[PDB]
Amino acid sequence: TGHVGHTMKFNNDGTLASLNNGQPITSVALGDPATNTTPVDMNGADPAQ
Amino acid sequence: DSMGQSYKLTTYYLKDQTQPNTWNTYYTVTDKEGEKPLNVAAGDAQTP
């Protein structure tokens, strides 16, 4: 459906194993229609947040 | 287990009739689905 999340992996002792294949979790711009197919209506605020 | 879940391990002892002074031992692990047999990798006691 085009929705992109992040995967979280855990060890057998219950501790965290890896996050996003070791990459930081940064989301796309909230109100920028050029980067997100579902832009947030920020009502004149910064669209690149 | 590794996560701290407790399971019931039932060990069954059978006295061998064909060979005197011989015993057969089986293991079973009990979960919420039932009693599942546990198999030995290189065991010399086999059933049909």
In contact, B14 and B28? CB cutoff 8 Å? no
* B10 close to B30: Cβ distance less than 8 angstroms: yes
Separation in Å, CA of A7 to nearest CA in chain B:
21
**Residue B2 at interface with chain A, using a CB cutoff of 8 Å:** yes
> Structure resolution in Å?
3.2
Record the tokens describing residue A42, joined without a space: 């920020």
> Do residues A31 and A39 make contact, with C-beta atoms less than 8 angstroms apart?
yes
d(CA B20, CA A40): 81
Experimental method: cryo-EM
Phi, psi of B2 (to 5 degrees): -65, -30
Query: Taking CA B39 as the corner, what is the angle to CA B37 and CA B40, rounded to the nearest 5 degrees?
Result: 150
8 Å CB contact between B10 and B35: yes
Torsion of CA B24, B29, B35, B39, to 10 degrees: -50
- Chain B residues inside the 8 Å CB shell of A12: 2-3
Nearest CA in chain B to A10: B3
> Any chain B CB within 8 A of the CB of A13?
yes
Q: What is the DSSP string of A7-46?
A: -EEE-TTS-EEEEGGG----PPPSS-TTT-SS----TTS-
Structure tokens at B4: 């701290």
Question: Under a CB-based contact definition with an 8 Å cutoff, are residues B37 and B26 in contact?
Answer: yes
Strand order in the sheet with B8-15: B8-15, B23-31, B34-38
